[PDB]
Amino acid sequence: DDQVKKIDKYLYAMRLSDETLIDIMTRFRKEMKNGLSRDFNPTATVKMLPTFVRSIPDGSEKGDFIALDLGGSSFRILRVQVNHEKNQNVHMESEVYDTPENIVHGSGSQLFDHVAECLGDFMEKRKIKDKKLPVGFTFSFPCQQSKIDEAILITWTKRFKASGVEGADVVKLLNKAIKKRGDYDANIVAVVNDTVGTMMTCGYDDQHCEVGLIIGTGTNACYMEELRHIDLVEGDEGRMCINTEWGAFGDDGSLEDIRTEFDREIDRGSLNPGKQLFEKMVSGMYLGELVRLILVKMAKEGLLFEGRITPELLTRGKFNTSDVSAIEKNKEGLHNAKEILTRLGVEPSDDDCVSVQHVCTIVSFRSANLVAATLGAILNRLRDNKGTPRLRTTVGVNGSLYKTHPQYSRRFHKTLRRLVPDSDVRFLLSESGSGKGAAMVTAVAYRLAEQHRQIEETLAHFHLTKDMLLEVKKRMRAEMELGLRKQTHNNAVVKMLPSFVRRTPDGTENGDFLALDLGGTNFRVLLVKIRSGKKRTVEMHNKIYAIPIEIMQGTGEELFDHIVSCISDFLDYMGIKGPRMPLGFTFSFPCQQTSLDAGILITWTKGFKATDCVGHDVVTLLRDAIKRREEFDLDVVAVVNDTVGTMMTCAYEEPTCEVGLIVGTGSNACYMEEMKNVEMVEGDQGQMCINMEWGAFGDNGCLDDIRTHYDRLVDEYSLNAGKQRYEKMISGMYLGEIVRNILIDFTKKGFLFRGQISETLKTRGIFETKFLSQIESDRLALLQVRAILQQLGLNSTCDDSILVKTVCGVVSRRAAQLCGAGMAAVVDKIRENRGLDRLNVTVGVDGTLYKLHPHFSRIMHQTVKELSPKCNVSFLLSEDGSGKGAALITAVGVRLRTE
Amino acid sequence: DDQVKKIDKYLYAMRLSDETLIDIMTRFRKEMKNGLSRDFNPTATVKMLPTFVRSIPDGSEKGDFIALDLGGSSFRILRVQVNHEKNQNVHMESEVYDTPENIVHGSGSQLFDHVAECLGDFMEKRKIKDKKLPVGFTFSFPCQQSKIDEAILITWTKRFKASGVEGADVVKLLNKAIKKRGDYDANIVAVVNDTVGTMMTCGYDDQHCEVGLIIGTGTNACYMEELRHIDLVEGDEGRMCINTEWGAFGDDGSLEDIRTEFDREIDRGSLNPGKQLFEKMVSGMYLGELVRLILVKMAKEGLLFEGRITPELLTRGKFNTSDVSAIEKNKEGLHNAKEILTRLGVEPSDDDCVSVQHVCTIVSFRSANLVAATLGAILNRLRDNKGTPRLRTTVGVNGSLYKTHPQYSRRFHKTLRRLVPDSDVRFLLSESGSGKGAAMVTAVAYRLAEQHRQIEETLAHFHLTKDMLLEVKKRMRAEMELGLRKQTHNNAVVKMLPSFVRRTPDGTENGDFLALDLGGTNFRVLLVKIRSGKKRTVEMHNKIYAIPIEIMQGTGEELFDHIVSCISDFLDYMGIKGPRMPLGFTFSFPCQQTSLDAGILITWTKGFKATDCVGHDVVTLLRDAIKRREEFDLDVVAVVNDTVGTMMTCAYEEPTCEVGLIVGTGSNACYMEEMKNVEMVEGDQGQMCINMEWGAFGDNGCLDDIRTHYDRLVDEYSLNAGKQRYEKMISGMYLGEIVRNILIDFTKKGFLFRGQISETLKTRGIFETKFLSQIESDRLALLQVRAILQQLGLNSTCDDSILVKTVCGVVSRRAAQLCGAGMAAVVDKIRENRGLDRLNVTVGVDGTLYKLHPHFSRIMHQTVKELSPKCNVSFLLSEDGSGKGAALITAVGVRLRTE
C-alpha cells in the first residue's frame, strides 16, 4: 500500500482540501462581481462577457438554419430544421471537416479561407447554395460583443494562434473570406460561445436549464444572470446569458498558491504563456501532458521504471488524455497502462502500471474538483438571485474529457453536490452538442434581424445623399430665380416677396416705437426705445398676450379686435396711453406688399385660419380695428415678416448680417437682393430684402422626389393640404407628426409597443418641439428616454425607447439637412451677386426648434459648409426677438415718409 | 373683520395650508434627487450645480484679495484682507459702481467691458494695479462649472438679459474685456454664486453653517452635499457645496396647481417668460408687481376704491415691494398705505388701506411659506445625510426683502421650524455680504491654482512641439550618417551595425531550424520548420526558460552554460537530440559582426551584466558552453538582433517590410540599407540590413536639449549610466521610472499623497509596463485608477489618481512621439536614398510596451505620418516572435556556404 501512500504525499500539492475548494469558490464568486461591475470589469480576469441571449428556447423557434462550430476538438457544420406548426420535429444533419495544425496556427486568412471553403462545400452537397439559410456560428473563444452578430476576438486560447484575428471581428473576417470566393452567399446572423450553445441545447429539453458547462479541450461556463446586474448592458428588464470565461481565472496570480511547479512548466511550454491558467489545470488539452511531466520528474528521481528514461518519455505530447482515460478504466485500466507505458520505450513493471494509473487519478481528480468549486460559485449566485431558500436547476454539459473519461463525471458531480448542499442540480448531457442550441439562437436572432432590416428600409427613405442635397440646393436656386423674374413670378411657388427694407441699420435710427409680434408661438406687444449717436442704446419691454384657438380660427374682425384690445392693455401697462405712436407690425405670413406699410395676406400658414383675412391688407384690418375701438390712435408705419425683423435685429450690431432664418413653428428665410434682380419692384438701384417664403418650396411637386409616405400623411391631414411642403419637412409644428406617423406604422407592423396603438399615439401634436429636443439629448440614459415617453402616455420598453429615439433622430437630421440645402442656395446666390470667389456672411436666426434642438443647428451648419464650400457662413442667434428689428425698420420708415 | 374676510376668500388660492406646504416640500425633495442623478439631471429643472467648494473656511485662509459682485441689486467691487498676523483678522473696503439698465440689457461685450472698466477704476484709486491680488468673482446666475475658475452661463435671470453670454464661459468673456483695455492684469481664480458666498461668509463665524440662502431680487439656496450623492462629479470622498438654483422649481409645470392667474400674468410681462416660476412667487423683484396686478383686478371688479382706476395704477412697476414692506409696518402700516395709494391717483378710503394691507400680507406670507417648504426639504436632506434623528445647523442668509420686510423673517422662520420639527436652526444674517466668503473661496482657489501652475510647468518640459520633433528627426538622420561613414564611425553613438543579411526572404527558405531568443522579457528556445516550394508552411514550437537574476549578472561561463543546459532540455522536449541541427541565435545587444555567424558583444544594455562577455564573440561563447557539456552538438549559423529577426518574420509575408522596430524592455530599429552607404563593409552591390542600435542616440549629448531632470535621475541610477539615453525615454523598462521620479518630486512639493513619500514609492520597478497600460486605459473609471494604485501600496485619493494618470500620459506620449521622430528619420532616408517623391514601406513591430499600451502605437504612427509626409508607412505587428525571422536568416545562411 506504500505504493500509493508514497505518491499521494509526493503530489501533496495536487490534492485539494474541501476547505480549499471552499476558498477557491468564494474567490470566484468575487471575480464574478468584478466582471459584472462597470468599474472593475476592465481589470477583472473573469470577463463575464454578455452574450445577448435572453433565455432558453421555448419551442416557438421555427425555420431552417446552418450552424458552424469551430474551436472545439472538431470543426463541424450542421443543418437544423424545425417547424412545429407543420409538425416537423427538431431535425439536424452534420459533417466534420479536417483542419491541420498548420491552418489553426497560420494566418487569419488561411484559417477563414478554410472555413469559407468548407461552408461552400457543405452547401454544395445539399445544394442549398441557392436559398438563403441563416448561419449560426459557435466560436469557443472569449469575444467582445455589442450585438449578437458581432464577435471581436479578445484572445486565442487552447490550440489556436492565428495571426491577424485578435482584436478583429471574426464575423467580418469570415464574410471577407466568403466574398473572396464569390462561390456563394452567407448571412451570419449570430455568434455564440459553445457554453452558450450547450446551455441552449439542454434548455430546449429541460426548461430548468440555467447553466452551460464545457469541459473538453478547454473549460468554461455560462449562466443566466439578471440584467439589473449586468452593468455593461443598458436595462433592468429580464435576464441575459453571461459567458464567464473562467478559463482565465487566476491569470493575475489569484491562484498562485494553488498552482504547482508542474502547472508552471506546462505553462512555459504552452501556446499562450501566462494565460488561461485555471483552465491549464483542468481541460483535456493539458491533463495528459501534465501527467507526462509528473512522471518524467519521478523517473529522473528513479521512482519509476527503476531509473530509466527514454527520448519518448521526454518528448512533448507522447502522453495523451486518451491515455489518462484508457488507464482510468476499471477492468482494462492496468492492462492499458502496460501497453501505453511499454510503447514509451520504458520497461514498465506491474508496480509501475499501478503507480502511473494513480498519477492519472490525482491529476484527473483535481480538475473535476476545481470545476466543482467554480460551478458551485455560479449556483450560489443563482439561488441568491431567485431568493429561494433551496435551489433547483439544470446544468447543460459537454466536452470530450467529460464524455469519455470513465471517472470524471461521477467524481465531479459528487464533489459539486457536497460543496453545494442546498442545490438540487441535474446534469443534462448535450448530445447534438452545441448545434441545436445554436440554431435556437440563430432563429431568434434572424427574426429580430428581419425587423431591423424592415425598419432600416423604411428609415432609409429619410436619408439624403451629398448629391441629393446638391440637387435640392439646385432646385431651390431655380425656384428663387422663378420668383424674382416677373414673367414667371405669378406661377412661382417660392414667391420672393419684396419687403421694402432696402438696407440694414445705419445707426441713425432714433425714437420710441411700438411693435407687434404675431405668427410665432407667442403673440406679443412691445415698446422699443432707440437712441443713436456717441451713446447708442436700445430699451425694450414685452408682454405676451394669449390668443385662444377659437379666435385664431374665428373671424377677421374678432382677431384684430383682440389684437387692438391687447395693444390697448399694453399702452396702459407701459403708462403711455394717449399720444399717437408709430408701430412696426411683425406679421409672420406671406404678404404681397406695394409699400412698407401695406401688405395683403396671400394665404394663411401654420395653424392660423381666420376668416375674411386672406386677400385683405393686414394694415387696413388693423387700422379698422383701431378705429372701431376708438380709444387711442396709432400710426402703423410698417408690416414686416419675422425673417426680415430677425435679420434686422441681428444686423443692428453685426453689419455682415444680410440673411434672416426662422426655424420654429414654421420655417422661412430672407436675404438682401440686388434691385436689378427684383423685377417685381421698379428700379435696379441699391438693394431690397426679399422675404422668400421658402416653405412653399415643393408645392409644385419639385420635391415629390424625396417626400415619403409619412410626409404625405402629415400634409394631407394639415389645415393647408398641398401647401408649405418644404416647411412641413423642417419646422417644429410638423416634425413630431412625421415621427408620430412613423411610430403608428411601426406599431401596426408589430415593431413597437407590443403592436398596440394607444389612444395617446393617435393624438396629433403629441411630439412637440420640446419633447423631440429632450429625446435626442446626447449621452441620455434609455431610462430617462423611457421616462419621457411614459410621461407622454406611451408605455414603452427599453427596446422601444431606442427605436423611438432612432426615429426622432432620423427625422430631425433630415430636417437640418434640407434646411441647409436651402440656405446653401441662398448664400451662394449672394456670393455670385457680389462676384466673389469666397463669401463671408452671417445669418440672423430665431425659432424654438433651432434653439432647443441638440443637433439641428449643428447638422444644419455642417450641411451649409459642405454644400457651399465657397461661403463661410456665420449663424448669429437672435436673443431680442423680431420686435427690435421691426422697430429699427419703423424708424427708417418714419424718416423716409417724412420726405 | 368683514373686510379681511372678503379679501381672504377672493385670494384663497394664495393661502397655503401646511398640508400643501408639506406637499410642495416633498416635491422639492424629489426635484433635488433628480438634479443630482446622472440619469434625470438633463431633464430636471432644479439643476443642483456643483460649485467646487469642498467646505466652509477652516481658518488657514490669508492674503490680499479682490472680489467682484454682480447680479444682486448693486454691482460691487471689494478688497478683502485676511491675516493672522494682523487683526482686523478680516478687513474689507468696497465700492458700488452705477450699472444702468442699458448695460444690463445690452450686449455681453458691453456688460463685461463695463465691469472691466470699473475694476480698472477701482484698482487705480487703490493703486494696487501692480500687486498680484487674486480675484474672486461672485456672479449670481446659474452656471455650468467643471472647475472653480470656470463659469458657463446657463441662463440669465432676474433683471439681466445680455446678448452673447448664455452658453459662454464668463471667466473668458471677462478676461477678454480686460485684455482689450490693456489697462492692467487680473488673475481671476474663482467664480461663485451669491448663495455660496453667503454660506462662506457666515461659515466664517459659525462652523455649523451648511446652507447659504438668498431672498432678495431673486431667490436661491446652496448647501453642503455628500460627494457620494453628486453623480456629476466623480468621487465619494467628502462633501461639496451644491447650488440648487431653486428659482426654476416648477418650470416644467410641476407647480401649476400652485400658481395663480396673477402669477401667470406676471410671467407674461417678465424678462424671462416661462422661467424661474418658483422665484416669481417669492423674490423682491416680483412681490410688489404681483400686488399691483391684484389691486387692478379688484378695482375693476369694484372690490376696491369704488371701482376707480388710474393710469398710475395700471402702470408696470408703480407698486414696488418696498411699498409692500412699508405697508406691513406695525407701525405706520395703514398710514403708509394711505400715502402710497394716494400717490397712485386713486381715492383711498380707510377701508381700502386695510384691504390693500391684507393683500400685501397674503402675497408676502405666501412667499415666506414657499421658501420654508423648499428650505425644509434641504434641512431634511442634510439630516438624512447624517443619519441622525435630530439636526443642528446654521443657515446663512442675505437679500433685501429678508432684511427690510417687517414681518417676513419672523413668518418664514416660524413656518420653517414648524415644517421641520426635530431640528435646531440658526439663521445668521450676512451683514458684510458675499465679499468675505468670496475672498475665502479665492484664497483656497489661488493656493490650488499655484499648485496646478507648478505641475503644468514641470510637465511642460515633456511636451514636444511639431518643430522640436522635426529637429529630433534631423538629428537622428545626421547620427545615422556618422554611423555609416567609416571616418566618423568610431566616434558615432548610433552605430548602424551590419547584420550581414542582404535580402528579405525570397520564399525558397526550407528546412528545420533551432532558434534562441535572448534579451527580451522572455528567454526561449524554438523549433522552426520551413517548408517552401509549391506549398509553404511554417510550424514552430518553443519553451520558455527562466534565467535566475544572479546568473543574468554572474559570469559568461555560467550564463552560456545555463543557455546550453536549456537548449539540451528543449532538444529532449522536441524529442530530437542526435543530429547537428543549424541554429539561429537571437541576441539583442549591440554586436560587432564580421560575418553572419560572428558577433562580438560591444556592451551590455538593459538589465544584463554577466562578466567576461563584453568584447567576446557570443557565438564563440555558445560554441564553448556546448563543447564543455559534451552531451551533443549543433551548428550555429547566425547571430541576429531582435529587430532584424522581427523584420524578417514580418517580411516573410510582406515584401515591402524593409524595417524592424522593437518597443519593449528596450527600444531599437533596423532597416535595409544600400551597400554603397555601408562604408564599414567592403562592396557597394546589393543591400544590407543595418541594426541601428538607436537606443544610444543622445549618448553624445545631442538630446540634452530635451532631457529633463527626471530623465537624468533615471539615467544616473541605471546599470549603464550615460548610455542608451534615447531608449531610456521610450522603452518599458524605463518609462515607469521616469514617472516614479516625477511622483516622488510632486510628493515632496506636497502635491501628492499628503506629501508622504511611501516605502512603496521608493521601490524601483513599481510602474511596470503592465500597470502603465492599465492606468491609461480609455474611459477607465477614476475609481478603477485609485484601485490599481492602492493595490500597488500607494494610498491615493481621487485627486491623486487624477495627477498620477496625467503624469503617466505625459510620459508615454513623449515616448511615442520621440520614437516616431526616429522612425520618421529612417523611412525618409530610404525614400531620399531611392530618389523617390513618395515611398511605401511597412515596418515589422514587436515589444510588450508596444502591444500592451493603449495609446503608444496610435500616437507613434501619427507622428511618423506627420513628420514624414512623403512616406506612407504600414505597421505590421509580429505575433510569431523573432525566432521565425531568425530561422529564415539561418536558412539563407546554411545555403550560402555550401553554395
Ligand SMILES: O=P([O-])(O)O[C@H]1O[C@H](COP(=O)(O)O)[C@@H](O)[C@H](O)[C@H]1O
Ligand atoms: O466534442 P464535439 O466534437 O462533439 O464538440 C462539442 O464539444 C466541444 C467541446 O469539447 P471538445 O473540445 O472535446 O470538442 C464544443 O466546443 C463544441 O461546440 C461541441 O459541439
Ligand SMILES: O=P([O-])(O)O[C@H]1O[C@H](COP(=O)(O)O)[C@@H](O)[C@H](O)[C@H]1O
Ligand atoms: O419664439 P418667440 O416668441 O421668442 O418669437 C421669436 O421667434 C419666432 C419664431 O419661432 P417660434 O415659431 O418657435 O416662436 C418669431 O416668429 C418671432 O418673431 C421671434 O421674436
Ligand SMILES: O=P([O-])(O)O[C@H]1O[C@H](COP(=O)(O)O)[C@@H](O)[C@H](O)[C@H]1O
Ligand atoms: O444686497 P447687497 O448689495 O448687500 O448684496 C448682497 O445681497 C445680494 C442679494 O440681495 P439683493 O438682490 O436684494 O441685493 C447678493 O446677490 C450679494 O452677493 C450680497 O453681497
Ligand SMILES: O=P([O-])(O)O[C@H]1O[C@H](COP(=O)(O)O)[C@@H](O)[C@H](O)[C@H]1O
Ligand atoms: O516579448 P516576447 O517574449 O514575445 O519576445 C518578443 O519581443 C521582444 C521585445 O519585447 P520585450 O522586451 O517586451 O519582450 C524581443 O526581444 C523578442 O525577440 C521577441 O520574440
Ligand SMILES: OC[C@H]1O[C@@H](O)[C@H](O)[C@@H](O)[C@@H]1O
Ligand atoms: O471550449 C471551451 C472553452 O475554451 C476556452 O478556452 C474558451 O476561452 C471558451 O470560450 C470556451 O468556452
Ligand SMILES: OC[C@H]1O[C@@H](O)[C@H](O)[C@@H](O)[C@@H]1O
Ligand atoms: O414663422 C416662420 C415662417 O412661417 C411660415 O409658414 C410663414 O409663411 C412665414 O411668413 C414665416 O416667416
Ligand SMILES: OC[C@H]1O[C@@H](O)[C@H](O)[C@@H](O)[C@@H]1O
Ligand atoms: O441672487 C439670488 C439668486 O437669483 C436667481 O435668480 C439666480 O438664478 C441665482 O443664481 C441667485 O442665487
Ligand SMILES: OC[C@H]1O[C@@H](O)[C@H](O)[C@@H](O)[C@@H]1O
Ligand atoms: O531588445 C530590444 C533592443 O534593446 C536595446 O537596448 C538593445 O541594445 C538592442 O540590441 C535591442 O534591439
Ligand code: NA
Ligand atoms: Na444592465
Ligand code: NA
Ligand atoms: Na427692380
Ligand code: NA
Ligand atoms: Na461623485
Ligand code: NA
Ligand atoms: Na560598403
